[PDB]
Symmetry: D4
Subunit: 162 residues, 8 copies
């Protein structure tokens, strides 16, 4: 079953969020992907959040740009851990996204990742690490992936041209 869901405020966010999905593909982690907007589909957001647990989601990755309300609104309607990804906005280069996601008041948390593509990928990795706590196989695949990343740098110490 899909233990993790990736949601975003707009299809225009996909160019960023696609990197979260990429991680799940590499790690062979079943995942759900959907466009859910707190501003354009508020009712759907509520139904989505309310049914998150019953649908089997253990982690929810939500991405949005500008005045991002999606991550926080979902977190306010469910106990499923919510990780937020600040999409890089045009004018404020994601600073508004970042602040509107991370500065949650006491009581309703949202684990925030870096602005942009790096954050999208990291949100998937973090969600995967959360799942790995109770999934020996995934935990193993995660370990292998990290090893591969490290070794790639280790076997290529000199950045200068050959």
């Amino acid at each position: 079953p899909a233990r993790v869901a990736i949601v975003m405020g707009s299809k225009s966010d996909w160019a960023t969020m696609q990197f979260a999905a990429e991680i799940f593909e590499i790690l062979n982690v079943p995942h759900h992907v959907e466009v859910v907007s707190a501003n354009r589909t508020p009712d759907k957001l509520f139904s989505f959040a309310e049914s998150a647990e019953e649908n089997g989601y253990q982690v929810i990755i939500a991405g949005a740009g500008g005045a991002a309300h999606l991550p926080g609104m979902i977190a306010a309607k469910t106990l499923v851990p919510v990780l937020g990804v600040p999409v890089q906005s045009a004018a404020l280069s994601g600073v508004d996204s970042l602040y509107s996601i991370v500065q949650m008041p006491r009581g309703i948390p949202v684990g925030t990742l870096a602005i942009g593509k790096a954050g999208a990928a990291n949100a998937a990795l973090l969600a995967a690490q959360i799942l790995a706590t109770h999934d020996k196989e995934l935990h193993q695949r995660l370990n292998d992936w990290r090893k591969a990343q490290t070794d790639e740098v280790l076997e290529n110490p000199d950045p200068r041209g050959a």
Copy 2:
């Protein structure tokens, strides 16, 4: 009837939002005041927004600090104009409040006012000006108020001590 409602994410916002109410008192404008949180009372926010029109509200002033979702979520659930007040937050002095309120994407607007007390008062004044468009009496009181503000400065040109 109360044609305007003043809502805020927390009772701790009252120290700021009280200045919006003060304007309505001076202008003799019936108003509703209530604590509505998108993060702590999400369901109530929805019911409040959905019934806004039927309850007779023509303008809604919403204030919040930090990652402010209140103004935007209300605006996403009603056609009643929503004015947002960025409450000055401790760490980011309202910058996060400001960005999380004003940077709304295309489709759902929130007329934003200055950070803090000045903004709270101005949101009431703006809402009043909106109501005055169809309320000759209020329009008159608004005019008198502005005159009084101007004349006070005009009759006190020298700021130095007498």
Copy 3:
């Protein structure tokens, strides 16, 4: 008659403000468009603001970039509600526009929208929502528009390639 006017500090602002006008076209809302600069045509700004009410304007959308004085100066000379649009400036990407428009002192409000194109469109939508309070037809068209925006997202939940 035109119940709303769209003004901007420079013709170079049109690339942004055009999106406000686009909304009015979609909603069939009569509107006036004009270049009015507080810095280059200060006298005209005053005459424009002073005659706003008599000319039938119920809302004024003003856009400017950099040290934006246009919105505030108009608001200081009329009771007609003024909505400001921060045009994205080159160096400071609209942050200066934003601050110079929203940070109005107590007494003279300016409902501010997002930086750039999204804000321009939203200012028109907000102005339209204000007009809809007393225009059943427009209120209906607004409702249909919102429905269309929501349904478009609802019928396209998966952002991935078919």
Copy 4:
């Protein structure tokens, strides 16, 4: 056993991190608390991170101010999910803390919370929600806590003085 550990760069961070511990006390969640500095006790950080899994930690909350390296360094040495809390710094009011924690590159994530006390508490709540995924009892206590927070606001709608 303690399934969660709370670490911080300095004892001066305790004034902030104490709010994370407070949450665990309310929720009856066994937790470990310790001062671990990437800058002053780098070797200890490594030993702490390396033994995190074997010691039974499923989540690690790390707080630091200024150029915060603690959260990221721990996350680079273990698969245990790491949540970071930006402590409010004097000069930059936590902005440096925030950026130095959240802007992690692809490969090593750190779920970041709000700057300051609110973030500390939220990091505990998020960690608790993560644990609740497999702890029915804790999940229940979390649910009761949220209910209590919501109801407190619901039974106190008017912020004005009685």
Copy 5:
């Protein structure tokens, strides 16, 4: 005659602008001081700017906080050089004041000074240096003042306690 005028948006600005006046007192430079608000006394601002030249002003120092429109509006209505002083605002510590004053578009300049008291004093010094270009006496007094400032530092090289 008074060749320089010091204006400010509010009497609350006097705590800052008083330092500009202090410089003129030290240099024995006749000056006019007055509260002129672009937002509260727009008409007066226009009359003041329009009559600036005929009244004998060769330099105008204008101070304001927040969305400062005063300096720019005066500069748009007269050829008399305008120097602007960003008053330190509460929420944004003068950053909004600074941006709203200095970021003037091509065509209408405003020589901006530092945020706060230091800027107020410097605006007077700069205005004095401008006047000194054609006032040998003032030029001399300016020179003596600078010498005194320099010598004070020179005769006190060690900041440690005696």
Copy 6:
């Protein structure tokens, strides 16, 4: 004689400062242009500043990007009014230029203009307005120029395509 000098930290600044010179060409104002760096030609800066008055300069326009020391260092070595132009830097888009120029301490002023090309032009206009105080002809040309700028906007009120 040349009553105004335009200096800059690097030849790479010319792309910006050229707009200051353009103003002087339009106004037929004799001017000197030279590359003077506080960091690369510190001694020359001193000689240039020290001889400014004797060389007949009444105003000095200095432009620089990044940690701009040029404007301030010149102002510290002469009584000739110094106007500073913040060149738009790559990384910080002129914010560092702006702060390093405008935030001068009490005692040594630098009238700062907008970041970039607009500021360069404005610095020339401001310097020209300063000179016009005692140059009836230039004052007249300035007046004509402003009229032309205003009239261009006035005769082109509609920004839409014909």
Copy 7:
């Protein structure tokens, strides 16, 4: 002999720079302390920089607030390594100090430390580490100091009250 000099733009900087001197006292490192201002004592700055090498200085720590020109100007006049300390300014909390010091163009470096007291101390530590490269004794004292700092944290792992 004194191999390191501590200079600052104003005696008001001493409250910050005193922490640099404190480090040298602890490490028994002979040092010179003096107020040198690029803005108020420009000539002295030049003489100081020019004679730095002949006077035996191997490192120069310079602190200043606001538009800090001191560090950069010294570095432009000598080959002696210059370390800069951004003093926390009132309005911009050291951000202007930071930018005006660190953003030096290619050719003239200034090793910058943290804003405020922490930076002052660190500049002394860094300078000491530089000297230690050729001073076995100092290198030893530095090592002991670091050990003491580390051990203090190590023997006090629990920040909670006994």
Copy 8:
């Protein structure tokens, strides 16, 4: 022997750090270049830092973008002076890099240079100046280089086209 080492968090940093190496080539200064990541090769970072002194390094230049931990972690594990270069990050244009490097707490310093290429070059120049303190030859080459930079500007005073 190589008395200076240039390290960076990723090979993608080479486009920036290459300018540090360029300086060493011009000055004929033996140097080591290597990719060392605190996040991807934490163990290697430790071994690298621990063996820095024994390997003969007297200065270490470390560059990284985003949440830069590399410079600080190295400095926490060795007495060899560490100079940090903030690589310009996409979203925050190096501001996050800058803050995460310079805002080190008391006890472990990192001399920080400008964001980007200019900083990379300057870090090499600063490191060279440090080495020159005990290398007469290098000190001479440094002097010649500075002379050449100065003279190039001096013989090209007019930036206008011939």
